[PDB]
Design a protein around this ligand. Structure first.
Ligand SMILES: [Zn+2]
Lengths: 55, 270, 309, 66
């Protein structure tokens, strides 16, 4: 973090980058099947349930 | 000095072979790249055969078990290669195919390898016979194959729960897709002798890669492998029924020519 | 009498050729009857090696408003027409064939020309329009037949379009079939330019003996297995395309009919709009009977195999 | 699965419905008493085929009349 988000601009953009990578991982995970519970996705993404619902 | 293409090819081949037992892919990958770059300039046929053998070894080592099997199978039907060396290359192809990611390409390679009689000569003949003729794999065939591979596992070990067991689980899920229309998490895990979470994860991975068709429902814990509506199932059953009728009629005519004479007499009377 | 059409009456043909009733009406010839033999031979020639642009002559006769095609044959084409036209050593071959036939029996003379359009539709291009116009100068009548070997696979069946040109300067009084055909971008330009310079004949096949022979052979050897599911029609691209084309044809008919109500005394519109309605209905009926036949074979077999006893 | 893998029965398993769908299976022995049932089954099939053959002929005659 001393050389990743140290730049204020990268600090601003890290939230968007995390949102994008989480969206990509979620989409890849839910492509092969259907009707999947939310808490399993939250545990896989290592984030809160509300964030998973919003995404 | 403007070294001729043969000398550069030999040097890069030697470096690549040395790096395979030193276990350092990055630089040997680049050296195989350059050896391929200058490869379509050389003349010597034996040098080309040695290069192809080394390239197949590299493919087997990295993760490219299917591509290594393809290259070894291509090299197996050669003449200048020693019969012992040809048999060794075919054995490498067979082991790579068994260890390969179980999919359409691996199924085609298994079908192709079920033709060589020197495949039947090998001790893994039974193994690929089981693979291609479709069955479920237990944990007792693991020992002999693991011993054969590289006194441990092929390439450079595996440690990914063994590539042997990865392939066993993949082929087991393929065989399940052959029979099981759908399966629950607990019963599938019991069949594969693994926890249900591992079974569902491996099934999802296989579905994502396109090697196993189906979809997974997480509420009921049921993975619907295959559902062929109602027409394809009915059509194949009728076609199989008619084919078995034709097989029977041929068998009576061949094994009992007197029946054919009786059949001609019966049809002429009426 | 199924075989009555095979009788050749030379004097009657001479009488018709002396009468020349086609000079009294440019729409005189309305029907084209093709023998099963000539159809098969032209489709087989057209298919040749995949999608080859080939051509030939048709032997036959005339009967009232009907042109009758009895046989067909091809001409030598060294180096795939390296000279002008697909003829090269054409005259010699043609004359030889004619005399040989007259001896062995065939007394039918030239009635037209056929050629193939691999995957671009059955129509007449500028070259073919000029060719059929010259075929209306020499050999008074003549008919241009167009085949599609690649659409015999794509559409599944495909008709053998039969066409006749209008003389230079002459306008179709109202003739407007409003028939849609899929024409490639590099071919639709020429198509639209010369499309009105000719008209299409109604192509029909007298139920003779050659036709039912082929039907029996196929359904006694290759199509003897009446399983294959039961409906290749299930793939909704051919029916849906015909359904969508039928919808567009009648939608344009209503738009013309709505605009034609304000004009009092336009007889041409009435005939053409009703002609469109009739043509569209037949296409739906032919599609309907095909699906009905599909289920009939389905029902009889499926009921038998499953629950016979 | 052992029976299927030894090329005895061909079919599919439905665990959700707890059903065993068998597409094809081998037969059993017939020497003493099942022959009469086989003859009866064959006679029923022959009678059924003749009934459909007569039905097709009637429909063809009806089509000719139409
Ligand atoms: Zn043309």
């Amino acid at each position: 973090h001393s050389n990743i988000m140290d730049d204020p601009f990268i600090r601003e953009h890290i939230e968007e980058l995390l949102r994008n990578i989480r969206t990509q991982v979620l989409i890849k995970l839910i492509k092969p099947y259907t009707r999947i519970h939310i808490p399993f996705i939250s545990k896989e993404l290592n984030i809160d349930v509300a964030d998973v619902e919003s995404l | 000095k403007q070294y001729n293409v043969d000398y550069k090819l030999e040097t890069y081949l030697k470096i690549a072979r040395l790096y395979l037992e030193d276990d350092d892919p990055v630089q040997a990958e680049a050296y195989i790249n350059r050896a391929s770059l200058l490869q379509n300039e050389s003349t010597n046929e034996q040098l080309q055969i040695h290069y192809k053998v080394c390239y197949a070894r590299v493919l087997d080592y990295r993760r490219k078990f299917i591509e290594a099997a393809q290259r070894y199978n291509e090299l197996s039907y050669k003449t200048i290669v020693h019969e012992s060396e040809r048999l060794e290359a075919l054995k490498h192809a067979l082991h790579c195919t068994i260890l390969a990611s179980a999919g359409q390409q691996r199924s085609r390679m298994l079908a192709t390898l079920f033709k060589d009689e020197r495949c039947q000569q090998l001790a893994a003949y039974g193994i690929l016979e089981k693979m291609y003729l479709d069955r479920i794999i237990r944990g007792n065939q693991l020992q002999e194959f693991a011993a054969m591979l590289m006194p441990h596992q092929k390439a450079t070990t595996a440690d990914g729960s063994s590539i042997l067991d990865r392939a066993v689980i993949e082929h087991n899920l393929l065989s399940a897709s052959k029979l099981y229309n759908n399966i629950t998490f607990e019963e599938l895990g019991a069949l594969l002798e693994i926890p249900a979470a591992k079974a569902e994860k491996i099934a999802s991975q296989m579905i994502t890669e396109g090697r196993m068709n189906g979809f997974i429902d997480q509420i009921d814990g049921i993975v619907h492998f295959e559902t062929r509506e109602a027409l394809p199932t009915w059509d194949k059953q009728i076609q199989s029924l008619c084919f078995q009728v034709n097989n029977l009629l041929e068998k009576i005519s061949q094994t009992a020519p007197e029946w054919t004479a009786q059949a001609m007499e019966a049809q002429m009377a009426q | 009498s199924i075989d009555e059409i095979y009788k050749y009456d030379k004097k009657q043909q001479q009488e018709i050729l002396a009468a020349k009733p086609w000079t009294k009406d440019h729409h005189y010839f309305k029907y084209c009857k093709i023998s099963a033999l000539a159809l098969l031979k032209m489709v087989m020639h057209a298919r040749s090696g995949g999608n080859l642009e080939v051509m030939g002559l048709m032997l036959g006769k005339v009967d009232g408003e009907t042109m009758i095609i009895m046989d067909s044959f091809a001409l030598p084409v060294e180096g795939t027409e390296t000279r002008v036209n697909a003829q090269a050593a054409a005259y010699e071959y043609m004359a030889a064939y004619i005399e040989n036939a007259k001896q062995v029996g065939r007394l039918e003379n030239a009635i037209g020309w056929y050629h193939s359009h691999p995957g671009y539709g059955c129509w007449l291009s500028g070259i073919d329009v000029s060719t059929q116009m010259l075929n209306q100068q020499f050999q008074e009548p003549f008919v241009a037949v167009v085949i599609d070997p690649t659409r015999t696979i794509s559409a599944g069946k495909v008709n053998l379009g039969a066409f006749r040109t209008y003389p230079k300067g002459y306008k179709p009084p109202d003739e407007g079939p409003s028939e849609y055909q899929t024409i490639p971008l590099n071919k639709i330009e020429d198509f639209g330019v010369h499309c009105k310079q000719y008209y299409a004949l109604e192509v029909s096949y007298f139920k003779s003996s050659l036709d039912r022979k082929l039907l029996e052979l196929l359904w006694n050897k290759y199509w003897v297995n009446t399983l294959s599911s039961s409906s290749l029609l299930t793939n909704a691209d051919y029916t849906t395309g015909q359904v969508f084309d039928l919808s567009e044809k009648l939608e344009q008919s209503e738009a013309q009919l709505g605009r034609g109500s304000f004009m009092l005394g336009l007889e041409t519109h009435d005939r053409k709009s009703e002609d469109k309605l009739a043509k569209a209905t037949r296409d739906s009926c032919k599609t309907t009977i095909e699906a009905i036949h599909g289920l009939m074979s389905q029902v009889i077999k499926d009921k038998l195999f499953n629950q016979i006893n | 699965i052992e029976a299927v893998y030894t090329d005895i029965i061909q079919g599919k398993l439905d665990q959700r419905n707890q059903l065993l769908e068998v597409d094809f299976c081998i037969g059993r022995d017939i020497r003493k008493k099942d022959i009469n049932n086989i003859v009866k089954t064959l006679h029923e099939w022959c009678d059924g085929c003749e009934a459909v053959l007569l039905g097709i002929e009637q429909q063809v005659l009806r089509a000719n009349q139409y």
